[PDB]
Write a protein that binds this ligand. Structure first.
Ligand code: GDP
Ligand code: CL
Length: 337
């Protein structure tokens, strides 16, 4: 049994015996978190802390509430502004005043905030048929993936005394810069996890936003996002430094993808795609497109997982499976400290 096989495997080790206090030494695992912007790397970092360490306590969550406000405000403003650039009128003409009031209020504030007035303005905008029609064309502009999440719970978020939930925090988009290092312990392995905006890397976890298949890059409107992370995977996966590195592929945002794929065709990303436009076929196709980039197949297996990184239980399940792979394949290259 897959987990037993890992337990057996680790029990074959004898290097702890070479240390005076071998049995309480720390077995160290260096893990690199890679992927395009907004692919989910920071979200996975949060999930490690939630799952393996303290968590995100309530006072920690309160620190994020203006971030939630800011995310919500950015989201609605992006949709309203797109309406203009895409020539979508408001379903109810009275909403043009709310749109203005949105800019008046955001225009005079210093950071993310929420008042009854502003909640009222945004909830009326979000309920409008025209705004909804613009929302449903978001692949044509740039919009936070959490737009719907926050805006549908606007009422809860608007409450005075609102206290951000874990899911609220997980759903935030926080501007990360440079390299973030996080430490946690799981199955007696001491993970050092690096999120890059390396030598002796035990494992790489490469994140892909599946839901990007119909989106265009932020910098350049004429540049398919999925293709960019492919070009990046290619480079990473076949990199000489990583031959003995377990390469794990998180095909992430599977929940957004499952919703997109119904009404938006894969052919946008891969024009040659000739399979049915269903979750099953299009997901598989994407997986095959990436895994096929592995130029040294005979001697390098890629471990692919379909994840929803904001879903704590899914990440725990997945990271558990990823950990048995490291324990079965890389343990001999992991030092004791
Ligand atoms: N619905 C959904 N949202 C996600 C998923 N993974 C990440 N997000 C959201 O996508 C946005 C960007 O994620 P982030 O982890 O910051 O990507 P990063 O730039 O690689 O660090 C955040 O608002 C996340 O909450 C997912 O699997 N499903
Ligand atoms: Cl308009």
């Amino acid at each position: 049994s897959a987990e037993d096989k890992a337990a057996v495997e680790r029990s074959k080790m004898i290097d702890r015996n070479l240390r005076e206090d071998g049995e309480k030494a720390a077995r160290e695992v260096k893990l690199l978190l890679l992927g395009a912007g907004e692919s989910g790397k920071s979200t996975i970092v949060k999930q490690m802390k939630i799952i393996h360490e303290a968590g995100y306590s309530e006072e920690e969550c309160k620190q994020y509430k203006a971030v939630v406000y800011s995310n919500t405000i950015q989201s609605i403003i992006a949709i309203i502004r797109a309406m203009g650039r895409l020539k979508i009128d408001f379903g109810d003409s009275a909403r043009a005043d709310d749109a203005r009031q949105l800019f008046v209020l955001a225009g005079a504030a210093e950071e993310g905030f929420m008042t009854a007035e502003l909640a009222g303005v945004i909830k009326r905008l979000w309920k409008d048929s025209g705004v909804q029609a613009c929302f449903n064309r978001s692949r044509e502009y740039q919009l936070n993936d959490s737009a719907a999440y926050y805006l549908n719970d606007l009422d809860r978020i608007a409450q005075p005394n609102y206290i951000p939930t874990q899911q609220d925090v997980l759903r935030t988009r926080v501007k990360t810069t440079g390299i973030v290092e996080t430490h946690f312990t799981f199955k007696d392995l001491h993970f050092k996890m690096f999120d890059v905006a390396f030598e002796g890397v035990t494992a790489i976890i490469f994140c892909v936003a599946l839901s990007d298949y119909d989106l265009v890059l932020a910098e350049d409107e004429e540049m398919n996002r999925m293709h960019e992370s492919m070009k990046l995977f290619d480079s990473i996966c076949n990199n000489k430094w990583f031959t003995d590195t377990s390469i794990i592929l998180f095909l992430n945002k599977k929940d957004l993808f499952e919703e997109k794929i119904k009404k938006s065709p894969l052919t946008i990303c891969y024009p040659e795609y000739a399979g049915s436009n269903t979750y099953e076929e299009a997901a598989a196709y994407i997986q095959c497109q990436f895994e096929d980039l592995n130029k040294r197949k005979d001697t390098k297996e890629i471990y692919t997982h379909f994840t929803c990184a904001t879903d704590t239980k899914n990440v725990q399940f997945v990271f558990d499976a990823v950990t048995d792979v490291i324990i079965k394949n890389n343990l001999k290259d992991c030092g004791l400290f």
